[PDB]
Symmetry: C3
Subunit: 532 residues, 3 copies
């Protein structure tokens, strides 16, 4: 043929730079000077030319004693408060614990390694003061850095300089789900973080160092219930993410139910339904006892239907003794702002309850439950049911049920529900300087974020860099200081919720994440410079 063709059946195998990799594990220096746990790891070796893929391992201890206890899912990531990689010239790269987690949110393997098992995350119960609740375990946390992007090409080079990796830890309270029965006071005193930093080191023969570009995240958290947040000195940004976080400071961080390892939306709902059912349908000899005076427990008629206002509940239990009767708690949990206002009753959220009474165990075994319980219901702190805004008692459960409530202090919760299902941003407005950069009603920016990144856990994100990661200077939003366009102001309009619904009182915090472009220069030690 006359035409010149490109070879698609063969390739010239290039000889690469002569190097040798090695997995290096290092023990750190623990410091507790708010008495926050800080681990410092010093990397200095004449043969370690470059490094990447930082993995922090943590030896979790044996948990002995009484009460309910369980670690948060992906415990290893939740342990980290802040990570900082510095040199003699200063901080090269740094991240907030939540942002590291957010970057690793789609890496299923990294999340599994950090601690995601029935052994770690299911809520285990200790019976004797020497009973083992949790056996000792080791978790591996992948510290994803921009030095991993293109493996050897993106690796952090060491120009005979001392690289220091500083890991700040969140209090153990954050990574633990426990009940009142558990002796947390002793546990918090005795618990110590046992870390070990691992990395892939490279010994390079005649390394030809060239300058590079690195993306670094920056978050700004707005004031409690303020729908505005501003990121200053925005000169070269690659992306801008916007999300909400719930503030549970006004509460005691206690919740009725938790599903454990099983983390699906249905799992959260089923756990809640199970916890309520114990007090919702009662088989007792005469009127049930051990409930507040405020509680309205009605006997189920021969018809099987109990009418709570317009809501009808069908309750039918088999093998009930002749001396006993079937009862229904018509106001298990209720909320109202006024005496002549809408009432949010959890008992009204049930339509059908069927089961069989066990004479052997003296308890009701529920077969089928027809309800309208949602993720939000499972995400309401117990404090909000008994808040000052409520004209009613609120929590009409038994003392036995209330004692089973669990403290959840997970630092990385988003939205207003445990699954971040409910979208509470009705409108988004992003301003560069004073002019509107972007505005939306629907979460189309989140839809694109989820689509482009092939993620199911996305955020309302504005991407400015669609340029390949390999051999390219990232495309950034250019600033105009003279025109005043040197800042990014975000304003949201929260979705209007009913005042008589307890979720309305969940304090919100707007989080704005900005990824800034920096230049890496290895001339006279490792140093990073902000692009301006």
């Amino acid at each position: 043929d006359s035409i010149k063709r490109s070879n698609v059946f063969a390739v010239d195998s290039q000889i690469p730079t002569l190097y040798m990799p090695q997995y290096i594990s290092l023990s750190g220096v623990m410091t507790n000077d708010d008495n926050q746990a800080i681990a410092s790891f010093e990397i200095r070796d004449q043969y370690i030319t470059a490094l990447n893929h930082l993995v922090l391992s943590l030896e979790l201890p044996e948990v002995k004693g009484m009460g309910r206890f369980g670690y948060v899912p992906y415990v290893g990531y939740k342990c980290i408060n802040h990570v900082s990689i510095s040199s003699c010239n200063g901080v090269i790269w740094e991240i907030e614990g939540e942002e590291l987690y957010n970057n690793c949110i789609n890496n299923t393997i990294a999340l599994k390694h950090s601690g995601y098992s029935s052994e770690l995350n299911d809520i285990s119960i200790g019976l004797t003061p020497n009973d083992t609740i949790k056996e000792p375990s080791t978790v591996y946390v992948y510290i994803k850095t921009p030095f991993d992007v293109e493996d050897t090409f993106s690796s952090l080079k060491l120009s005979d300089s001392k690289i220091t990796v500083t890991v700040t830890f969140n209090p153990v309270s954050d990574i633990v789900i426990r009940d009142s029965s558990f002796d947390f006071e002793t546990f918090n005193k005795e618990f110590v973080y046992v870390p070990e930093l691992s990395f892939i080191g490279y010994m390079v023969k005649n390394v030809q160092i060239k300058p590079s570009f690195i993306e670094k995240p920056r978050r700004v958290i707005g004031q409690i219930n303020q729908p505005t947040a501003t990121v200053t000195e925005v000169h070269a940004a690659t992306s801008l993410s916007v999300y909400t976080k719930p503030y549970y400071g006004n509460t005691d961080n206690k919740f009725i139910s938790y599903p454990g390892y099983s983390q699906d939306e249905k799992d959260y709902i089923d756990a809640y339904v199970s916890r309520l059912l114990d007090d919702l349908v009662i088989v007792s000899d005469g009127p049930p006892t051990g409930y507040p005076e405020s509680a309205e427990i009605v006997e189920v008629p021969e018809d099987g239907i109990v009418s709570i206002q317009d809501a009808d509940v069908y309750v039918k239990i088999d093998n009930v003794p002749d001396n006993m009767s079937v009862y229904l708690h018509t106001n298990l949990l209720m909320f109202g702002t006024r005496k002549n206002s809408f009432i949010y009753n959890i008992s009204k959220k049930f339509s059908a309850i069927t089961g069989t009474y066990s004479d052997a165990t003296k308890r009701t075994i529920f077969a089928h439950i027809s309800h309208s319980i949602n993720i939000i219901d499972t995400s309401i702190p117990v404090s909000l049911w008994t808040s000052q805004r409520n004209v009613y008692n609120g929590d009409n459960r038994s003392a036995e049920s209330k004692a089973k409530d669990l403290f959840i202090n997970d630092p990385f919760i988003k939205g207003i529900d445990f699954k971040n299902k409910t979208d509470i941003i009705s409108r988004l407005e992003v301003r560069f300087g004073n002019d509107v950069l972007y505005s939306e009603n629907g979460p189309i920016s989140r839809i694109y974020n989820e689509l482009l990144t092939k993620s199911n856990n996305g955020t309302r994100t504005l991407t400015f860099n669609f340029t390949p990661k390999i051999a390219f200077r990232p495309t950034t939003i250019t600033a105009n200081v003279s025109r005043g366009k040197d800042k990014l102001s975000v304003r949201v309009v929260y979705s209007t919720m009913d005042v008589n619904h307890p979720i309305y009182y969940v304090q919100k915090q707007l989080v704005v994440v900005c990824n800034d472009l920096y230049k890496v220069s290895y001339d006279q030690g490792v140093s990073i410079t902000k692009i301006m």
Copy 2:
């Protein structure tokens, strides 16, 4: 130190080496992206919903990643209702992207779905939730069946393949995106009780097209190559289909589709959101069980004269011809007896020949009678029910070919039947499990291009595309996309090699089985190569 002594000595020069520890950061073309959302123009020209979106801006240099949002309304009233899974994709009948020079790219709704079938995120966004897909029941004429929702449909185009590089460029031209919608009947699963007549009248498609626009400073446009699908649907029950004017094809896909025109599109059961094979079967078993095993005081009533309900003997075994059914129910009242419907659903072509009985498909039924609810709670069911059984339209049980009554269920059960009009069903079953092609033959003109017995072309399709929902596909292009000109099957018009003729050999099915009467349609998809030239407006030319 930290590095091992064996490593240090191994390294610690003359040969030229490629730098693997650093890279030259190239300065890219100066551009700025922006997510742009546009409201369209609704047209009803029979009376097909057509949305037109006009894109014309001097600063929108290029665009890609088309996302069509749809506002689903609040569904109020009585009866059973639910949307089909991935409702957003099923909503689309045809998509066309055109310019002043004509159509640039166009796709059939099913082919867009087929291209997005492996994108789990895109399928979730289009409408895949218990809130949307489970069959909800309305009790009062003002009861809310379904709350309003917004779905997002990703219109995957060849302009997304290599992001900015593959993007559709606008040479100061008007780009028009035309979306033709399928009737709402297709995207809805409802019963007779539901007022569909009022719903069909009141329902309107509310769309909004979104895309990633790019403002490029001094754009250097170069010509490109685009692959465009083209389907041919063969005649009802015919095992042949031919694609004409095949000059430069990159691939050829072959699959089967059922035709339910001869039926009223009604089916006994539907699993809702839970879409697994077992879910479909369990739903069917659950729907049948209500009439299959009856606890009654004397012989059961409310069943046709044709029904043969036999009392279960002390041994527990009821013999329906060769088939033995073991039925044992606990807590049965002394005044009542356990009964078994021995011919719940039956089919036969001749007066005393072979019979396909659904009751014979059960071997063991165990449970406990509830005195409180006056109903039987089934514990364990041993059966041989398959996906095909759940995919048989009710019409075929009561067809003229059947010598028997067919549907011997209660009127209560029959009233619970659901209309399913999903436009993207493949094969002869709801899960496309049953492979009905015993042999495939592809002819380029008069000569055999490819032939197979097993679905090895589907195995390669699934393997190469990392898909679990593949088709018998012949790929001709194994060359990297965008970077090169795609490898195509070259035509020979003179010899008569300007057409692809597909011939299949369907599996031979039993005449006494209702699935035999399910009309089939062979679908052949051809991906043709086209050249994109941006000289004096955007234009595409077929490679010949």
Copy 3:
């Protein structure tokens, strides 16, 4: 419309075009899926299939797929195929030419390379139809319907599609597939007639590949990675790979050896392959004999069995362990009984006992008068994956001072033979990590040493796998585009071998898992050069 802040932001330096690309005309070729029938040769009477590829138009090939026609299984008894049956069928694969072997792999190593390809594993046979244990009632009853399984033979010629393809310089390429005995791929009970099945069963293979007809092919030399395994002596914590000159990676894992047993196990979960599924299947199998509702003391159990009646209290005390048993709808003439020593193990007559009945804390259910059996509602136990992985032989071994298997004859008849060739660790799920320390020596000097499985963590991380091994990677350089980075050897210094030493964690001698034999497996990936000058040939880099 574009926003005013964007237009003003944009409206001399050399820029790379990111919005357009020059469409290169590729090498003129035509692909074709080619399927070939082989030559079956039984000459240990191992099934060997040979496929000869020689055609003037087949210039190059890649993506080898082995089809396998599984027959209809008729008769009586319990039968089921192993998960990913197609991969388990293969014992060895060899691709050779007139110059010799180009590339070869062990069946387990091919499986290990394809372990993360979900599609390839599904194609090989992963269904409820194939993997659940079906039961045949009549001698003419169909246990399993005939099926076709597709096995993807992943070769280094698939890495960069057309670029990495195996070129044929007018040479005869022979693909040789050695099969494992059908015993390995089958889970059956004693009731099943395996003797007749093993005689009648024949491997029906067909090799498929993507052939390419290239016009004026410009062949250039390439680099290939080839695996090599070394299996250590039974229970030996050391293994050595000789002639290591240019290795890209080194994997280390453990395998159980069930030669000292009859390969029979109490339970198997079928298609459902999760850890919980394995445990639940075991609990279900034990429960039949664990809690008995009988009129007077239960019968049909060995003299050695200690079946105690459950008191009004509901608690039965087996030494320190307390079992709460409460069953509803029990007839007045009948009583609730608990087998206090269903399975037990001890090395000394009056010492520590490992009792499976002690592993249960609560058992609740309801007696069915209609079916005359107990339907269990909730079971609170401490049963683990190891328990489900103990062969029945070890419960009744000579080491045991007790009888061991105190189950009913009915339960014992339900035991299944499992001969899966690709089991790792000491449990069916390879959950239990038994390596306490790993030591790798290149020559006589320590190359790498670790306590924790940080090499496995990196393996799982870098390869995006959930089924990883303690692996040492030496090549972090891009595949095909570059010559792979390898460990360089020094023959003169004796640095030409990789010696692996492990420290296994020791189990309790009174636990039946201690008597499960281990085997250390060391995999070495060596670099080879492919030269197509005067036929296809591979040369080891030294």
